[model samples]
Target: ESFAFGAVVERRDELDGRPWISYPVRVVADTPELVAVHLSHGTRLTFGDDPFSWGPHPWQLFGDRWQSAGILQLHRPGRGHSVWVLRDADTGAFREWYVNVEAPWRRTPTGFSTLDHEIDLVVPADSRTFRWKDVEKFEERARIGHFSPEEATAIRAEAADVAREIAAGEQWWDTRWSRWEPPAGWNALLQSFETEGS
Candidate 1:
């Protein structure tokens, strides 16, 4: 596995029909189809929120502080499964888990990229309940050239499969990690990686 200590987590505007914006992040893990990172101690970003973005979205307005952001990204190389587990710092609690049932991630020399298919799943912190989010938005995006008919069809099917898995109670992240704190060793590890790469 590869580790990028201080990386940039950029939100793509494909869903909002905008461009991508980036900010600093602490990457705790990185590999093909899997990237888990947190926001820096005091960083925050706010823009229009996608149901499938890296953070939670109780309000239609999207935003989060880095000190309070915990993100776990899981995507399959050739599938439409992109799941994110998000925790908020301000509440000091599990905010919600969001899934982006989208196009397969395209990894490049720079980073991974993909378009949002628009369909998504939102499971509250309790994890027992979930509902499809943004069907209307998905339809709107598809109507506006965000996704083609074929792509939207495939994305919907994939989303159904993910919902089934969650209904079966498949465990993903550690719930105890709701209060997880970064270990001091992580800073040292990142420093070493940066030094060697430099």
Candidate 2:
């Protein structure tokens, strides 16, 4: 709901561990055990031409108790839900989705954790549109930092400033405001991440 292509899809629980509809999915760790599903007929509907097509991608656990069961890739069928894990081909630094029993709980606590701000500030940390290779540099450094309560607060504030700048910068968007130009490495470098197709 905060961004486009990011639907406010509801979560459901199934006896067999699949999602259903109408209820909020549980967060085992920092990972979400949920899938985006259809809820048009006052009932939940599963996607995929056939069952067991593609679902959870597996989430990595943060704390001892917090874990995720991976998330659905919204872009699967057509830009289906995407789940990402950071992996270093050279150094072998990698993390993936897993079950998180103590999620939503993880999002809130006494204060924002260093991990929280890093996850929040870094561009496309939760995005399916942005390619991972382009961000490996930022990831490598970001993964190593620890934020104090004050530092985390400042980071959030700075992030807000950046967001505002981005919003203000959009004034020149649209066909009438300016002309579109393809810069060096344009397609691979920058994108609007808007939802394509229906």
Candidate 3:
């Protein structure tokens, strides 16, 4: 039940195995603790008609290519959070860590399936100075039944604990894995697109 190193996979939905806005990615490392993936810039994205609205979510693949800094997403074991390694778009310098608070990674045929909680945490190189992103939006979604009351409450509970740990320190942050650079030749996998792998 493990994705191989350098496997090209889709980061999809858990319920029906749909991609995250239909984004494609390449697997980097699949270890006991971490499943890392590379999502390069210019990768196409599928968008719903409204794009922002969370509705029936009939997704359509248009010509929208990701234009921001490419990311190396570290989907981890346990808990509902994954830290994405991002670089400065213009200078390509080491940027802040984007911690998405979500359901843990679930293995699927194509890639992995996980739900985004909308709320996330952002940490700079300093690490100690961290900010929670989309606090209001998370509540808004939960209020509208995107998540049940218990579900939202539990998510918030975890977020509370996670916030304290973030303030203290984290293993990945301590190791400064955010500064990790991919080895040569890995980018070629980004060009050679794939779906499910054997």
Candidate 4:
């Protein structure tokens, strides 16, 4: 737990133990039940260009233009997906919640790894008014054999449960974090991937 607060770490997505995409993130908080990390916009990243094939894909290490959106992610051990707090790029205000359906995260010496479970949910800042993202893409991914029938069913179940919980007001994390901002110098870890040296 020494990575407690203010440690920059990488969050890697993998397929069958092969890394698919990875990016730098700062560990804003680490506690017994929750581990939160922050991914600042414009942080460099790497991913396999053909990852959607659900099979063997080629790696694109640190491509010149691999930066991504800013997100503060909340993780719970063994949870199927993580909740992300999105912010306005211009004003830095809390925007909405984006839930990335993924496998339970596995830890690594550097950070952690998880496989994206295909479907995602976008919840408005106010209510349980949320929309599912990538349903067609998820269907296609399944059609293309990305996941077996059983695996696909399990993935859908998780998202469905999440939606039900949100609407029932059982799973809403506070938005009061609207006032939460990063402290000074949490930026120290994004400079380079530790792997860059080795």
Winning model by TM-score:
4
Residues forming the 10-long window of minimal summed lDDT in candidate 2: 98-107
TM-score of each: 0.63, 0.18, 0.81, 0.82
Query: What tens-digit string does per-residue lDDT give for candidate 1 at 71-182?
Result: 5555555777666767666765668778877667654444455666668898888766899998898888778766678887888788878788788886344455455566
Model 4 spans > 4 angstroms off: 48-52, 55-69, 188-198
What tens-digit string does per-residue lDDT give for candidate 4 at 1-198? 447677777788887556677777888767657778887766766654444556533234435333444678887677788998887777777878888898877888988888888799988777548888988899898988888899899899988988887878777465665557776554423444434322
TM-score of 3: 0.81
lDDT of 2 at 166: 35
Clashing pairs in 1: 43-66, 68-89
Task: Say which prediction, candidate 1 or candidate 3, comes out ahead on lDDT.
Answer: 3
Candidate 4: C-alpha lDDT:
0.74
Q: Best lDDT goes to which candidate? A: 4
lDDT scores in order: 0.57, 0.25, 0.69, 0.74
How many pairs in model 1 have backbone atoms within 3 A of each other, for residues 3 or more apart or on separate chains, i.e. clashes?
2
Ranking by lDDT: 4, 3, 1, 2
Better of 1 and 3 by TM-score: 3
Ranking according to TM-score, highest score first: 4, 3, 1, 2
**Model 1: lowest-lDDT 10 consecutive positions:** 189-198
